[PDB]
Write a protein that holds these residues in place. Structure first.
Motif, PDB file in Angstrom:
ATOM      1  N   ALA A   8       0.802  -1.222   0.000  1.00  0.00           N
ATOM      2  CA  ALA A   8       0.000   0.000   0.000  1.00  0.00           C
ATOM      3  C   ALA A   8       0.846   1.289   0.000  1.00  0.00           C
ATOM      4  O   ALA A   8       2.071   1.274   0.193  1.00  0.00           O
ATOM      5  CB  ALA A   8      -0.935  -0.056   1.210  1.00  0.00           C
ATOM      6  N   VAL A  25       4.546   0.935   2.324  1.00  0.00           N
ATOM      7  CA  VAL A  25       4.271   0.827   3.765  1.00  0.00           C
ATOM      8  C   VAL A  25       3.993  -0.627   4.184  1.00  0.00           C
ATOM      9  O   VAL A  25       3.271  -1.356   3.504  1.00  0.00           O
ATOM     10  CB  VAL A  25       3.165   1.796   4.226  1.00  0.00           C
ATOM     11  N   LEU A  26       4.575  -1.051   5.309  1.00  0.00           N
ATOM     12  CA  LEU A  26       4.327  -2.344   5.949  1.00  0.00           C
ATOM     13  C   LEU A  26       3.192  -2.267   6.981  1.00  0.00           C
ATOM     14  O   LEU A  26       2.493  -3.255   7.199  1.00  0.00           O
ATOM     15  CB  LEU A  26       5.621  -2.839   6.617  1.00  0.00           C
ATOM     16  N   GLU A  27       2.979  -1.100   7.600  1.00  0.00           N
ATOM     17  CA  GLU A  27       1.911  -0.878   8.577  1.00  0.00           C
ATOM     18  C   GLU A  27       1.550   0.610   8.730  1.00  0.00           C
ATOM     19  O   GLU A  27       2.412   1.480   8.588  1.00  0.00           O
ATOM     20  CB  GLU A  27       2.320  -1.494   9.924  1.00  0.00           C
ATOM     21  N   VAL A  28       0.288   0.890   9.073  1.00  0.00           N
ATOM     22  CA  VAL A  28      -0.249   2.212   9.456  1.00  0.00           C
ATOM     23  C   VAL A  28      -1.132   2.066  10.703  1.00  0.00           C
ATOM     24  O   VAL A  28      -1.917   1.116  10.782  1.00  0.00           O
ATOM     25  CB  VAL A  28      -1.042   2.856   8.300  1.00  0.00           C
ATOM     26  N   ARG A  29      -1.038   2.984  11.673  1.00  0.00           N
ATOM     27  CA  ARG A  29      -1.806   2.972  12.943  1.00  0.00           C
ATOM     28  C   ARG A  29      -2.324   4.364  13.304  1.00  0.00           C
ATOM     29  O   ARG A  29      -1.563   5.326  13.242  1.00  0.00           O
ATOM     30  CB  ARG A  29      -0.938   2.467  14.119  1.00  0.00           C
ATOM     31  N   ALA A  30      -3.573   4.469  13.753  1.00  0.00           N
ATOM     32  CA  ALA A  30      -4.098   5.661  14.424  1.00  0.00           C
ATOM     33  C   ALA A  30      -3.909   5.506  15.948  1.00  0.00           C
ATOM     34  O   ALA A  30      -4.412   4.549  16.545  1.00  0.00           O
ATOM     35  CB  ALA A  30      -5.568   5.837  14.026  1.00  0.00           C
ATOM     36  N   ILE A  52      -6.877   7.732  10.359  1.00  0.00           N
ATOM     37  CA  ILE A  52      -7.105   6.962   9.120  1.00  0.00           C
ATOM     38  C   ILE A  52      -8.558   7.157   8.662  1.00  0.00           C
ATOM     39  O   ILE A  52      -9.492   6.776   9.372  1.00  0.00           O
ATOM     40  CB  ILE A  52      -6.753   5.466   9.309  1.00  0.00           C
ATOM     41  N   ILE A  62      -4.238   4.421   1.074  1.00  0.00           N
ATOM     42  CA  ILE A  62      -4.650   4.771   2.439  1.00  0.00           C
ATOM     43  C   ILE A  62      -4.698   6.305   2.554  1.00  0.00           C
ATOM     44  O   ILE A  62      -3.658   6.963   2.495  1.00  0.00           O
ATOM     45  CB  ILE A  62      -3.674   4.127   3.453  1.00  0.00           C
TER      46      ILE A  62
ATOM     47  N   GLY B  53      -8.551   1.527  13.287  1.00  0.00           N
ATOM     48  CA  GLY B  53      -7.461   1.525  14.266  1.00  0.00           C
ATOM     49  C   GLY B  53      -6.085   1.296  13.639  1.00  0.00           C
ATOM     50  O   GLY B  53      -5.149   2.055  13.910  1.00  0.00           O
ATOM     51  N   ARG B  54      -5.963   0.274  12.781  1.00  0.00           N
ATOM     52  CA  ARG B  54      -4.711  -0.067  12.078  1.00  0.00           C
ATOM     53  C   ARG B  54      -4.941  -0.779  10.740  1.00  0.00           C
ATOM     54  O   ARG B  54      -5.980  -1.405  10.525  1.00  0.00           O
ATOM     55  CB  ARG B  54      -3.790  -0.903  13.002  1.00  0.00           C
ATOM     56  N   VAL B  55      -3.914  -0.739   9.894  1.00  0.00           N
ATOM     57  CA  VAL B  55      -3.796  -1.478   8.629  1.00  0.00           C
ATOM     58  C   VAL B  55      -2.418  -2.150   8.607  1.00  0.00           C
ATOM     59  O   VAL B  55      -1.401  -1.463   8.524  1.00  0.00           O
ATOM     60  CB  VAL B  55      -3.970  -0.541   7.413  1.00  0.00           C
ATOM     61  N   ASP B  56      -2.372  -3.479   8.716  1.00  0.00           N
ATOM     62  CA  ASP B  56      -1.136  -4.276   8.695  1.00  0.00           C
ATOM     63  C   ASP B  56      -0.934  -4.951   7.321  1.00  0.00           C
ATOM     64  O   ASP B  56      -1.551  -5.975   7.022  1.00  0.00           O
ATOM     65  CB  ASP B  56      -1.185  -5.320   9.821  1.00  0.00           C
ATOM     66  N   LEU B  57      -0.071  -4.384   6.474  1.00  0.00           N
ATOM     67  CA  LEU B  57       0.191  -4.871   5.113  1.00  0.00           C
ATOM     68  C   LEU B  57       1.060  -6.142   5.071  1.00  0.00           C
ATOM     69  O   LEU B  57       1.125  -6.803   4.036  1.00  0.00           O
ATOM     70  CB  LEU B  57       0.797  -3.753   4.235  1.00  0.00           C
ATOM     71  N   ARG B  58       1.681  -6.531   6.194  1.00  0.00           N
ATOM     72  CA  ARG B  58       2.413  -7.804   6.340  1.00  0.00           C
ATOM     73  C   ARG B  58       1.483  -9.025   6.307  1.00  0.00           C
ATOM     74  O   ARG B  58       1.913 -10.112   5.915  1.00  0.00           O
ATOM     75  CB  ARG B  58       3.223  -7.819   7.651  1.00  0.00           C
TER      76      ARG B  58
END
Lengths: 70, 70
Positions: A8, A25-30, A52, A62, B53-58
């Motif tokens: 993403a 991106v490997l991860e995104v967090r609020a 997000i 995203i 809350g989150r998006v984990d692309l792994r």
């Protein structure tokens, strides 16, 4: 599906009125009144005053939004 | 090709302490007061009192959280 595969990407607007994008991106967090996001470059970014807003899996986009409207 | 993009999946926790999942999602949206999400079946869902809350692309996992913590 598509002819190739990628992770993403994140997009946001600053309080400055300018814009920023983050690829692979490997991860995104609020979290904590901010958005955090981490990449395969071992780099990690933080953007205070965001949440997000949207995740569009058709294109891997995203979109972040401002948590305040003042 | 070989290799191609694939859809995410959503998870959330209910007020009863049970859990719900939505597989192979095309899109997820937050509106502050609720989350909304659409599948490849042309079926759409809505969940009041949540935010993304989150998006984990792994792993392809999207996780939802409660929009108030009080």
């Amino acid at each position: 599906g598509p002819g190739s595969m990628c992770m993403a990407k994140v997009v946001l607007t600053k309080a400055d009125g300018g814009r920023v994008e983050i690829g692979d991106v490997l991860e995104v967090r609020a979290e904590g009144g901010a958005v955090r996001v981490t990449t395969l470059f071992d780099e990690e970014h933080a953007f205070p005053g965001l949440a997000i807003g949207r995740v569009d899996l058709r294109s891997g986009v995203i979109s972040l939004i401002e948590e305040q409207n003042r």
